[PDB]
Amino acid sequence: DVQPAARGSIVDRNNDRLAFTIEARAAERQDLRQYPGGSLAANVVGGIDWDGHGLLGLEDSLDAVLAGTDGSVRHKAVHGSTVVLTLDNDIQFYVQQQVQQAKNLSGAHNVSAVVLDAKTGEVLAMANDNTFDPSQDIGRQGDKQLGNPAVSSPFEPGSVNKIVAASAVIEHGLSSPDEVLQVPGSIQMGGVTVHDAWEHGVMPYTTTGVFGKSSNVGTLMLSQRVGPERYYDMLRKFGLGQRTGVGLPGESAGLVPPIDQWSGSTFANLPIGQGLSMTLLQMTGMYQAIANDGVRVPPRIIKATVAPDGSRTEEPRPDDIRVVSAQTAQTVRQMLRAVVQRDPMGYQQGTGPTAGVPGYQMAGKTGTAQQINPGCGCYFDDVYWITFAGIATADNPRYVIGIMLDNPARNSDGAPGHSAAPLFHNIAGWLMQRENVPLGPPLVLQAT
Ligand SMILES: *C(=O)[C@@H](NC(=O)/C(=N\OC(C)(C)C(=O)O)c1csc(N)n1)[C@H](C)NS(=O)(=O)O
Ligand SMILES: [Co+2]
């Protein structure tokens, strides 16, 4: 009497299957969900329940689309539609593996990474370490990561947030990349004392060098030209404090204190990435705006759905958001090339030279944010969130890559330090080679 609907599949942008159903027998008919890639993109895809409905992930949140509606006899069965993701399984597989060995090598508690298409903001890869296997019973996997931290778990960004100050000061014509500044080792601002991460007297850092060397003091001096109102407006245009609408369950909105509630010291903290929180996806989406010539396109992971007849409907594209002009975006991209620039004499070296890939205009920004100690409500001394966000490449943006490491003891490649730059190096370099992308003078970070 009951006419069962057949569950739809979940496939990547090229129709490579991530989840699909086969008929079997036991209540005799029994549909078996198949995950041919095992843990591959399981943070996104999710898993199935005993009744063949979604248990978590997209299997759950899109269950109505995937499950259809059982018929009867007449009411015809509406079979489940197929969900086409923006993911590229080849990119996802490489990124997910690289994230696992970044976690193992660095000693971090966890690692995650997001790759966006520069122009469209589509999610090409989204991965975390320790990803569970939905072909196995969830109850045996308490030691696994079952969720999707890239969207669910916000963090204080620290210096990766400096993209906002850089964009604001250029967009309003308050500085230029080659302006020679005078940057002291510390300043008193908003009642508090801000110090750079290295001891130094007044240094002739250029604006480029302020972001290339990650001078907090230089960032706040330039932010003082912008002012609180224009700065807060730029934060909002970059999408912070708001869910992206990416189409994934459990997305956090992050947290940004609205300006009418700022303390006297908020403005001394936000421009260097303290006092607010964002997800990895939000962080990566910020750099997508700059990659796409100033136009932020909210990321999406659902590309299309295919009805049981086989007719395909593309997902509606989100509306453009103009953050800065194309000219500003191009200037900020070029400036952030300084971060990955190497200099044997030290003087013109950025914070992340291992992120550079020779032959390509890689551009990005490092972050090292002190974590809050839950036992005191106060900052740890030696526990960090490490971030990197970059663009491949500055002259031809194709890929935007965001990475976060939860308190690594070492570099992402296992060398001493605390940097995610090597993981960006590996991923961005591999993306260039696999598409056979073809290969000026050194940027000045420090004047006389
Ligand atoms: C930016 O990320 C900048 N980091 C900081 O100023 C912060 N902490 O710096 C260290 C780790 C030196 C500290 O112990 O204070 C910071 C900002 S918000 C937060 N919770 N901590 C660094 C120096 N820039 S980077 O490019 O070198 O990463
Ligand atoms: Co009827």
Ligand SMILES: [Co+2]
């Ligand atoms: Co150390």
Ligand SMILES: [Co+2]
């Ligand atoms: Co290499």
